[PDB]
Amino acid sequence: PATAEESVDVITDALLTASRLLVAISAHSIAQVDENITIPQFRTLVILSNHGPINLATLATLLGVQPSATGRMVDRLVGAELIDRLPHPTSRRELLAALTKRGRDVVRQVTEHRRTEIARIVEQMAPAERHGLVRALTAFTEAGGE
């Protein structure tokens, strides 16, 4: 019970602090695996894990980046041996990007750190709060973007 109602402002403030705790969790996870990797780099890695081999055009669209800056960065990650480039089945031109075994290990290690840290925090919460938290973040995800 009950609450309520809750104003935008108090909901936003609570979500803001929650967002800092999730960044803390991510920072811990990313740094443990790769202390140098950037935001757009890791996002690229996750995209490829989630969608599998895709052309640079498609990658760029999902990244929200210009195709030109995507090529440069893909190349860096190729040099870090996290991404391979593959011929299309079969276009000219393109050209598809996919994770190396290494790229895959990066994404899965970061996830495993995140879930261990989350689990640790969740153990400290009452079962009813845990459930309420899933509800709260799901509702937020539903509302926008959406």
Next chain:
Amino acid sequence: AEESVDVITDALLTASRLLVAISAHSIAQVDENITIPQFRTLVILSNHGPINLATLATLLGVQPSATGRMVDRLVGAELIDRLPHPTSRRELLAALTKRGRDVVRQVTEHRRTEIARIVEQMAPAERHGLVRALTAFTEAGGEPDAR
């Protein structure tokens, strides 16, 4: 069986995707070059004041060698000053620079603007029981209020 945990944790990896992307975007929009661990370092510094490397690394949950390296970088980028230890020591303290504080403030204000825009879109009917749950999350996680 139980427990699981765990099932909740999994539901949470999925449920938190958006907030995380919004957070990551907000950092990236102020400085293109700052990593997420780097940004967390700055937030810890605004919350904890000047602290030494051992304390920073522990609060970050990152290995000290790597922590030391990312403080060096942030020093190079004028976001962090190294200060003398108040008592004895030997070890130098790390603290925010004015520009450092602006970065933290800017990223925070921009993320808040995106969050509230999305909160305006939740039906008034469903605006119940949200704060309680979120607050329990941050208390359990030890995260200070944003504010």
